[PDB]
Every structure is written in C-alpha cells, then in structure tokens.
Design a binder for these strands. Structure first.
Lengths: 120, 50, 74, 60, 102
RNA sequence: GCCCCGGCGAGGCGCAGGCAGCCGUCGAACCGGGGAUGCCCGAAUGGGACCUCCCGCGGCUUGCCGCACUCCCAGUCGGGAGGGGGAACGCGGGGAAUUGAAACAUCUUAGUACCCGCAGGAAAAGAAAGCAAAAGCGAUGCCGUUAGUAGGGGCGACCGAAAGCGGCACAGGGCAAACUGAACCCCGGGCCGAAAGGUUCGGGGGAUGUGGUGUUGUAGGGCCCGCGGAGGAGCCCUGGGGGCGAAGCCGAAGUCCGCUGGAACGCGGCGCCGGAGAGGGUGAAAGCCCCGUAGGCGUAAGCCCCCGAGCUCCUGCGGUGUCCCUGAGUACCGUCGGUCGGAUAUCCGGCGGGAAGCUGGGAGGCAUCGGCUCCCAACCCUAAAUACGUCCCGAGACCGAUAGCGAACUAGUACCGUGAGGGAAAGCUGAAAAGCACCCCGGGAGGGGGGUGAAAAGAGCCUGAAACCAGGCGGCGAUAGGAGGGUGCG
C-alpha cells in the first residue's frame, strides 16, 4: 500500500476501513531462521494450516496449529491457547500475528509458492 | 363502508408494519447497543400525516 | 525588541476598563454624531473644535489646471 | 446449479426449469410459516441465473 | 551512513549525536493528536559548498543538518533563538564565505 | 443482488460481538473494466386525476410497437430539435426600506437585499471611426501602483475613476458589395475504400443569386495592361518505434541474556541496519515484531510524439487608368426620463427631426472658424494568462463531546405547526467475555453465600468532584437576643 501520510487520523482510518484484499498483508507473521534460510524470505502472511510458536504474552513457548483467521478483527486462533469459562468449557484466546513466529509452513497451494518466488 | 382511497390505504399499511420493537437477537448480536429506535408511534399520542 | 503586553490583561477586574461611569461608553451619542457630524454648516456641537484646530476645511478657494497642461520642470 | 451446466441446454429446458423452481419456492414459502433455512435464497438466485442466461442466448 | 558514523567518531561529535538521540522525548499535550509526538533534539550542522552524496549520507543521524553556504539562514545557526551551534565547515565553504562576505 | 474478462491468493455471508445454515480451490469475498434486470409518481409526454391511482385507441402476432405540445426539413411517408435539474463562480433586465447625515426633503443606505429571464465547465470581452501630444504606442482580459488623486456633492455627510508605468500570458481570422452567373449545397438508395472522401440513379433547395472572387485609409479591393504558374498544408490509419499512463510488485536490520510486572514497547547489559531514526499498529514509552518509509519496479486499455500509408480545393508578382465598391431611420441636433467621478465635457432608452456616402467620412473634455495629429463606425467568429469548489487530495502556533459544522451516533432524524416553515438530545467494560457455574430465601424485580479477573471495572460498566440525603463518631444541646463574624482568655 501507499501510506505516506504523517497524519494519525488518516493512518487509523485506512486501517479500520481497509478493503478485504489488503488485510492478509496487515496480518503477516515472521519466519524461523531455518525457513528464512531455505527460502530466502523474512515474513509471510498467515494461514490456517500453519504451525506457529507464541513469542509474547502469557502463552509463551507454546507451539501449535492455526485453526482460525479473522480479518474483520485482526486476530487468529491457535490450538492449545485456551482459557476456561465459569461453567468449565474451553474457549480460544485470540492473538495478533505479530506476537507469533512460523516454524512450519503449509504449502498445498500454488499461489503461496508464487508469493515466495516473487519475493525471494 | 368507510371509503378509503387505495393509495392512502397502502401508506397506512406501511405505517402499521413499521411499528414494533427491536428484535431480541439483534440486541444479542450487537451486545446491548441497539435497543430502541426512533419510530415507536402510538395511535393516541403522536398522529401521522394521513 | 521591546514586546510589552496589552493592557486589557491588566484591566481584568477593573469593571469599567478605563471608561469611567458605567453609562459613558455607548454608541454614536457618546461621540456626538458619527464621523465629521456637527462640524458646522448645519450643526455646531463640534464648531469650537473646528475653529481652533481645522479652519479651511469648510469652504472653497481657487482653481486647478489640467495635468494635460501642467508642466513640472527639473 | 452452475452456469456451465446451464449453458449446455436449450431454452425450453431452461423454461421448464424456471416453472419447476417457482413452484418449489411457493411451496417452501408456505411451509416456512408452519433444516437448511437457505433454500429460499438459493432458489431465488438460481431463477435469476437462468433468466440472465436465457436473455443472453436470445440476444444472439 | 556507516562511513559518516566512523568519520564523526574520529572527529569527536558522536557524543553530541548520542545526546540528541537520548534527549528526544514524547511531548506533553494535545500535539500528540495532531502529529507532533516526539520533540526531536538538535545536533551538529555540516556546511558544505556543493552536495555530491553527503546529504544522502548524513541525513539519518539524529539532530544532524546539512546545508550549502548559498542557502544558509539564521534558524540553522541559532535554534530557539539561542546561538552557539556545533558546526563542521568545509574549506570550500570557507572560501565561498570569503567571497560572499556574509 | 445476476453474467463475463483481468488482478489478488483463502476465506467469505453491510452498520452489527446471535441461533440455524449456505457459498468458495472448477480461483469466491475484495479491487479495475464492461454488460443485463431495472415497479409507481415525477419535464412526465396516448387521455384523466379529492389522495404516487385509474381509463382508452390502433395495428402484429396472450405476447408486442406506436398514439403529447411548440417548432425546422419535408409531405400526405417519415427524419430531427426543445421542455426539467445543478452549491458557488457567469451574462442580461426589474428594484426597496431600516440606517448615516447627531431632526430631515437633494444626498446616503444601493444599482444593495429580494424578484424575472438565459448559459457553461468556465462565462463574458476581444483585433482601434482607439490612446496620445512637438515623442510616440499598437487586439482583449488579470495582478501591483497611479490615488483617497482628477473630479462629483444641502461643495455637507460622504462618494470616487482612467490613461500612463512595472509584470503574467500572447494570435489573429471571416462576411456584405463591386466582378462572374449554376461552374453549387443537403437527404436516400447502387458501388470503392481504414479513410480522408470519390462516383452513379431518385428526390429537396437555389436567378428575390448556390458556388468562385474579395475584406482595407487618401487607402484597400475589383476591372485593365502585362511578366510569372512550389498551396501543399492538412486529414485516414493495414503498417512502426518511443513515451505517458493502473488496479498492482520488491523493499534493510535483535523478539539476544537478567530484574519488575497480568502483559515489556520499562530498567540494566551486549549487538546490528541505515538513500530507510516520517507516521501508525501490536496486552506499558519499539529504527531492528508488523504495515509501511527512503528508494528501486512493471504495466492492458486510453492518450501524445514522430516515419511512412491513401487521398484533397483555389492559386503569384509590377504598375496605369476622369472606370466600379467599401454596412441608414444609422452618424448628427433638440427635448424628456434614468444612470455616471464625468463636471456647459459619461453611458442607456423614449419622442420629434434627420445626412454625406470615396471630389467621401469621424475624433482630439463648452460652442464654433482655421491649421496639425490620429483613425474608417453603423455585420460575424476567436485559445492562453482569470473566477468557483455541491466533489477528491494533502497539510495545520485550529476544536477536543456545554467545544468543534446543527449533526463524532439508526440527523436536517425524532418531534411541533392547516401551511409557508421551525427543529433536539444522545461518545469511552476489560489484554481477553474470561459477560458470574453451584447452594439457601423471595410471587417476582432481587438479596445473601460462592466464583472470573492484575484489578468488579458487572453492561444501571474508565476516572467519578460539588451541591443534596441517610447512618455512625466527636462537641454543644429546653431562663434564652442579633447580618451568623473579629480580638483576647478558658
């Protein structure tokens, strides 16, 4: 995108009302050194079957799989990152993807490989 | 018997349908924000424009 | 250079802002008419001022020639 | 219903199909007043798809 | 920028660059809503005769300004009305000042 | 919400945090381009409207097209134009009073408010019957000065220019007539072509003149003699290269080790990038976590440039002449009304008179006479420099929810008035709903024990002032006199 505006209200307006096809890139996560080396890429946008390691927060050191990506709210769900309700059922804690690191990719799709080849 | 014109009848029918309270699932979906709207009209209090 | 402050600042709390009784700072009656009213020729409230400080404001004297004919030499 | 499957067929099959779908929509709207609460929406949209494709076949 | 880093370490103004980095603050008041977060502090000024690369190279250091002699005004030399700014002159700028006499 | 072509690359189903479900990898949502459907009223138009609904004609085969008024071309067939809407800016007409003059009548307010008509993305103006004055300039429009000057004015209050000078931007063309006399234009069909546009039949115009010529100062043109015969600048795009021009692409470097904490973006220590230390987001103050940023990238249609491609309508120079022509209720005078700084010397209109017309005509601040200087009206077109912003973009010694637009929100909304018209209030849980499982009482709203959370911050939700109210604590409190205070001693 072309965000050259020193004005905070304009930045925040863009982010709150961004079209859907540009929110995947606002939801990008970094890669492990290993994949960084073997592919030549520093970050990629997040996807459901990816395996992630939590880097900041209460759930530190937890590895797990992505099971939900929500673009309206800018949050993801990760299996294993859960808290209990008063009654006792388990619900997911939502995370921002800039707090997680990708330690294993899910590549059963050609266009994501295209992304990689474009930016490596 | 009381002799209405058809177009006036249709406008009165719309005014009749308009007049109900907010649905409950809307309050739930919205997390108790939308709970009343500006067009509750009662036939003794506020008269319409025929 | 010398940047002194305005005196409305010092007159906060004065109640009349230097103008005297609370009845004296009103409209055109408080000036005796608007502008050069009353300087003579019909009314005379400022005729004393006219005869001290501004004679030859009322009346006419002389004639001017056109610029097409005026020559100013160096 | 998909437009590729609708483009293999003749205008008369398209017409028969619209008749059938309209009858279903009426029946469903009657029972609705009495399991997939989206039947009405998908039937509506299918009728629309058929009419579009019939018009574009005629204009040719 | 790294070359300029080394040069400035050798000439002895890196400490003022570091002061300017350290003394930058988030300001008080409603300026934060209008931009104007981050009052930024002033460091050294490089006066040059021509730009051939050095604006590129010195821009990004906190508090550093680069100017030609021909376009030199008083705010570059006395920020906040206060004189006495650390300034790196070139020999060609010195000669061109000789010419301009001012 | 239906279809297609491209892009993006996995989720999506408006504001809007629900129950059930569906669409999508056969490339969706979203973005760019293009199509389809598109009820009634409304200029509203087949004819009528006391209720945005009714009632008909035809002709073709229920399904279909056509049928308003005013006008042009026509012609008993048809082909065309107009009507309504638009914030501010634009052109042309009609035109007050409050007010000031310390009253008021000329004046001022004011060619203002408001009314009527007419256009566009800009409009209007515009190529000297001019400005000047012993020198000269050279179409129009805009900016700065000229200047509160010349001048107007109960010569009062007040009103009020231009030329010139310095700049921005530049550009000039065509009719009428004299001479010629059908050599001409338009519509349809048959052909050729990418096309510029040719050529044929059938019609409409035109001798009350279609086309050719020609467009200016003592001049220009025509005719008349003659020597010369570079209109060739434009237009069409089978071809062609370049460039502008997208949605869109790429874009550096720590989540390193201890303490605090619910959570590091903190403190202390150790490193790195920088043409990038603008701004924002992320569970606290982040150049190195993410978007971006500096800076490199590419691009279909659409558009500009030029090489080529095919094709067009009249043509110069020098001068002679008792030969012809060059705009009429017009120029000009008198009078009345309006208007202007325009004063005996501004412009507009009405009424009564009224020319010359190339051996001619006009202007030069009262009239007229004579000189000198400058020009040729009464017919037409014309870019750029300028004004505006109902829209979009960027920025800010602007406000920060009684502020700022009336409106931070389901606002010109609710609501009031027969109607013209008038017109509010109303922002904030938490990092995460984790939005209180379970037991006793109560008809119930609820109370009490227990739980979630760093914290109840419990939706009657950030902080949570004062006035006011209830209870608890302390001092006084039923023989007593001053605006509720001051000094001194208990």
């Amino acid at each position: 995108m072309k965000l050259d505006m020193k004005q905070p209200r304009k930045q925040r307006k863009f982010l709150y009302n961004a079209p859907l096809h540009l929110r995947g890139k606002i939801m990008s996560a970094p890669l492990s050194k290993e994949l960084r080396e073997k592919y030549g890429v520093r970050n990629l946008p997040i996807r459901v079957g990816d395996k992630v390691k939590v880097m900041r927060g209460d759930f530190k050191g937890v590895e797990g799989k992505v099971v939900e990506v929500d673009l309206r709210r800018y949050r993801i769900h990760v299996e294993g990152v859960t808290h209990k309700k008063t009654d006792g059922t388990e619900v997911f804690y939502p995370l921002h993807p800039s707090n997680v690191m990708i330690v294993e990719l899910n590549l059963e799709d050609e266009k994501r490989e295209k992304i990689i080849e474009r930016r490596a | 018997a009381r002799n209405k014109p058809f177009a006036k009848k249709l406008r009165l029918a719309k005014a009749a349908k308009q007049n109900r309270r907010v649905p409950v699932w809307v309050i739930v979906k919205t997390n108790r924000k939308v709970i009343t709207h500006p067009k509750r009209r009662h036939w003794r209090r506020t008269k319409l424009k025929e | 250079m010398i940047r002194r402050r305005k005196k409305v600042r010092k007159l906060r709390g004065s109640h009349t802002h230097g103008w005297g009784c609370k009845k004296k700072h009103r409209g055109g009656g408080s000036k005796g008419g608007r502008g050069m009213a009353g300087t003579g020729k019909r009314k005379d409230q400022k005729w004393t001022w006219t005869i001290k400080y501004a004679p030859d404001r009322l009346g006419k004297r002389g004639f001017h020639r056109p610029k097409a004919v005026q020559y100013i030499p160096k | 219903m998909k437009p590729s499957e609708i483009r293999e067929m003749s205008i008369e099959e398209i017409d028969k199909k619209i008749r059938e779908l309209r009858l279903e929509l009426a029946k469903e709207r009657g029972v609705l007043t009495m399991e997939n609460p989206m039947v009405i929406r998908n039937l509506r949209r299918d009728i629309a798809r058929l009419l579009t494709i019939k018009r574009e076949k005629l204009r040719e | 920028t790294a070359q300029t880093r080394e040069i400035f370490k050798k000439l002895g103004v890196w400490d003022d660059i570091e002061r300017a980095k350290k003394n930058t603050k988030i300001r008080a008041g409603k300026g934060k809503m209008r931009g104007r977060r981050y009052k930024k502090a002033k460091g050294p000024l490089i006066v040059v005769a021509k730009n051939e690369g050095i604006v590129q190279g010195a821009r990004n250091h906190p508090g550093v300004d680069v100017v030609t002699v021909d376009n030199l005004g008083v705010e570059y030399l006395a920020p906040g009305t206060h004189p006495g700014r650390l300034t790196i002159w070139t020999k060609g700028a010195i000669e061109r000042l000789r010419e301009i006499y001012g």
